Design a protein around this ligand. Structure first.
Ligand SMILES: Cc1ccc(I)cc1
Ligand SMILES: [Cl-]
Length: 162
């Protein structure tokens, strides 16, 4: 298992524009296009991202390239953030994947509310961090996804994905 296989399981693959769990236009392996309600705005964002007139549909190769770009961007966001980088650097490789997963889903701003969880993770208080992470809108809105990610933080294993 690696970060790409983990996120592919959590996000799935769709080659036509779809709506995510919050109702936002998305394509590929969880690539957010826009938070605007306008399908035309989403199609414009798609064409700009891919570099051709897609009319709302992409190829599997295109989805996989967007996905590589999005994972790279999540990692770079962690490394440039003075609050996230020291926590990330303290984690083992499996728990680092759980961190990337959360940033991929919620972005740097979405993780800003997890300040107490970050401190517990840096101190390697895994059970306490797991409870704190579950006290969140994230866990209440996408509980199965959150349970897999939290279990990965708690155990440092891939058991929730196997
Ligand atoms: C919630 C969370 C976000 C970033 C890191 I690094 C660890 C935990
Ligand atoms: Cl879920």
């Amino acid at each position: 298992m690696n970060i790409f296989e983990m996120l592919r399981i959590d996000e799935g693959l769709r080659l036509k524009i779809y709506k995510d769990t919050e109702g936002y236009y998305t394509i590929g392996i969880g690539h957010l296009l826009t938070k605007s309600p306008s399908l035309n705005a989403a199609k414009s964002e798609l064409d700009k991202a891919i570099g051709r007139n897609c009319n709302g549909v992409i190829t599997k190769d295109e989805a996989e390239k967007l996905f590589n770009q999005d994972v790279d961007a999540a990692v770079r966001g962690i490394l440039r953030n003075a609050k996230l980088k020291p926590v990330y650097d303290s984690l083992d490789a499996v728990r680092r994947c759980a961190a990337i997963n959360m940033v991929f889903q919620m972005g740097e701003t979405g993780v800003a509310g997890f300040t107490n969880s970050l401190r517990m993770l840096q101190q390697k208080r895994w059970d306490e961090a797991a409870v704190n992470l579950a006290k969140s809108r994230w866990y209440n809105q996408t509980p199965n996804r959150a349970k897999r990610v939290i279990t990965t933080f708690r155990t440092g294993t891939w058991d929730a994905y196997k």
